[PDB]
Amino acid sequence: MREVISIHVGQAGIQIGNACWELFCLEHGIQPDGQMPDAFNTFFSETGAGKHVPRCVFLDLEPTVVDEVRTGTYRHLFHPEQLISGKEDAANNFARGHYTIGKEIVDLSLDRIRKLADNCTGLQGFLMFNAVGGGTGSGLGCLLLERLSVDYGKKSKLNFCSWPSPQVSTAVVEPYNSVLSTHSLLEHTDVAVMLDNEAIYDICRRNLDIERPTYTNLNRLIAQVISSLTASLRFDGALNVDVTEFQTNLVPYPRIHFMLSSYAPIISAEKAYHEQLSVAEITNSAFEPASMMAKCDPRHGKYMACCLMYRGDVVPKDVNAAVATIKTKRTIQFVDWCPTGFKCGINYQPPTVVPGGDLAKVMRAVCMISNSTAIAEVFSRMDHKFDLMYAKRAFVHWYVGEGMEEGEFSEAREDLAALEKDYEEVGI
């Protein structure tokens, strides 16, 4: 059988988590009381009486958003000890997560992970959902990812990240505890999808027409991406890609695994019923230079490998025409050592609609997950942000007091610098 664990670390992991688990329950017709009124697995474990329980762990050091789930509309659906909340927030301190109070949450979280990593078989992927620039997401994310790479080894891990944006930021220490967070995504991660806030901020006020996107609308759009990623696992389709061919077709070199995301068609109900949305321009709007979910101009760099998870009423003869259209375009470049670089897949269900959400149901969607050279500049903005920080050692006393040793700041500098060196070395 198939199953993926859905570890949600941090407050962003919880808020994204209750939106993706919202959508998984909607597409399988599973109510919050667990009852259907064999595709429930890869996300749900049957418990005898029709009680489908999700396969995740809600993980947050502070008891304010986990307890909100334990009092909200999903206080039933989620298993009680599956939800784990500690006592204090990590105060946007990577030392407070990875070298302080996080340990007494690691033991319980790895225990419950071990419970539901042996209740069924397969164990295809370990989905992670964390916020890089924050506190408990960066610290408890680094501890728990490093422990699973030793214990639950040789199993793929997909770290959906909410990486800090260049001009938008909600915390002044995000330059520190993101460079101090790359060293878990560089040596304990097989696939690291970079989603940020600015590029999905903009994608809602010109495509969804919403002048007030809130964080829930952000959590719905990432929920569509994770749904189309894991749709080819559960539901039967055409030529298919799952988590293991996902690594052997997007990761050319072992340490080059930082890639982007793009979803289409995100167009509201007043708007989507006017266009064709045909297979030619829904992948062409996927390769649109502003349509990525990451602030990354793709034209100061060459593409490396892309997977096109089409989902719905697509026929494989239609995808080969759209592949030919994108290749003949002279805006998207490619490296010379990758002649063919599109590993597409097609499922048969249309993407599901959320009643009350600001989307209309289309019968096909394009989610591209593309590895590009241009992702190096995304990390390079906060290379410059850390340099302004570390010149006069701002905010170090909060870090060194908890558990820090003053040298991992320079170790993280060399880890990101050697990371940038390889993106300009691969594309020659």
Binding site: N18, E22, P32, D33, A49, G72, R75, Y215
Partner: protein, 90 residues
């Protein structure tokens, strides 16, 4: 908003007691009343993991060694039913 405090003068009349939960989560992800649902536990106390009892006990010999015509009907209701070939082939 002092005009709304005229009717709950003790407020312990249970009319305004616990009638709100006013967070962004309830703004964004709710429908009709599936948050205040009581948790059904057991009708026989702390031991009973679910609802069961004497109306479901059927020991093994009684439950499978029943007469063949009754088992015949019960499973007819659930879907009971060098090489060599025929003389046609050469």
């Amino acid at each position: 908003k002092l005009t709304s405090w005229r009717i709950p003068h003790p407020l312990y009349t249970e009319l305004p007691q616990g009638s709100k939960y006013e967070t962004h989560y309830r703004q964004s992800y709710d429908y009709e009343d599936w948050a205040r649902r009581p948790v059904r536990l057991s009708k026989y106390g702390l031991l009973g993991h679910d609802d069961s009892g004497a109306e479901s006990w059927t020991t093994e010999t009684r439950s499978e060694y029943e007469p063949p015509r009754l088992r015949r009907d019960q499973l007819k209701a659930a879907g009971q039913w060098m090489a060599i070939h025929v003389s046609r082939t050469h």
